[PDB]
Design a protein around this ligand. Structure first.
Ligand SMILES: CCCCCCCCCCCC[N+](C)(C)[O-]
Length: 251
């Protein structure tokens, strides 16, 4: 019954573990040398460029594991899509009220001799264009800081990876390759870590995207299940049991 929502919850909490830990810890970012590249790979698996690859594969794969009760599965991926739309809607809509530095911006204004008092005594958009110019004077990492922003926004990356992971844990505990759960969990954590290491986000931001991710996934499961039909074990109790007893077979 409510079991999904239990697991989902637990999942959130689990994924809340690392960032709250970090958040409490007083850690700060600064230069290093090879980690940046791996973290950049991990974030690039969510960036779109590519993709859109991870996303589709996870989509279809989920649909396989989501068989039987697949009637709601599509509904589910529609709801998620809907909020996704809603998402890009709000994102693009307000870039006004942010006014917050990204971990690297602080180190920058410092390193570049920019009185913080004066730094915020200046405008709003001019600040951003100045961060752009200060960035202009590794390379790909610069490309990423430019492409992203001066101001820190919510974490899309976190939200996406975390929503996937949450979906994974929550709506399947009854096994289709539990490797999928463990992998989405570790991967999600890896994206969040990727954001931290790259001077992209403050730990609180990660915590919050994980929460948003939680609420989104929750509302989506409850609503998709409302109309019509849940998963729940599908007949697939017998089929999953049939795959379970195949584990001890050989003889
Ligand atoms: C900065 C990018 C804006 C993203 C818009 C909001 C995204 C929330 C969608 C999370 C759902 C991920 N999922 C489960 C469909 O894979």
């Amino acid at each position: 019954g409510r079991s999904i929502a239990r697991r989902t919850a637990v999942g959130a909490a689990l994924l809340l573990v690392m960032p709250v830990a970090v958040w409490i810890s007083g850690w700060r970012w600064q230069p290093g040398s090879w980690l940046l590249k791996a973290a950049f790979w991990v974030t690039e698996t969510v960036t779109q460029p590519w993709g859109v690859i991870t996303h589709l594969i996870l989509f279809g794969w989920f649909l396989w594991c989501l068989r039987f009760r697949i009637k709601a599965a599509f509904v589910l991926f529609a709801i998620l899509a809907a909020a996704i739309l809603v998402g890009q809607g709000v994102k693009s809509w307000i870039k006004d009220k942010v006014q917050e530095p990204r971990p690297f911006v602080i180190w920058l204004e410092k390193t570049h001799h920019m009185p913080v008092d004066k730094f915020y005594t200046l405008k709003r958009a001019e600040r951003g264009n100045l961060v752009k110019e200060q960035l202009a004077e590794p390379q790909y990492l610069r490309s990423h800081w430019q492409k992203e922003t001066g101001f820190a926004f919510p974490s899309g990356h976190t939200m996406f990876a975390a929503s996937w992971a949450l979906l994974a844990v929550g709506l399947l505990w009854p096994r289709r390759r539990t490797l999928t759960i463990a992998i989405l969990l570790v991967w999600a954590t890896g994206v969040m870590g990727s954001r931290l290491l790259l001077g992209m986000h403050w730990p609180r931001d990660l915590v919050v995207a994980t929460l948003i991710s939680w609420a989104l996934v929750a509302v989506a499961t409850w609503l998709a299940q409302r109309i019509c039909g849940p998963l729940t074990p599908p007949e697939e109790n017998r089929e999953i049991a049939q795959r379970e007893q195949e584990s001890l077979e050989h003889h």
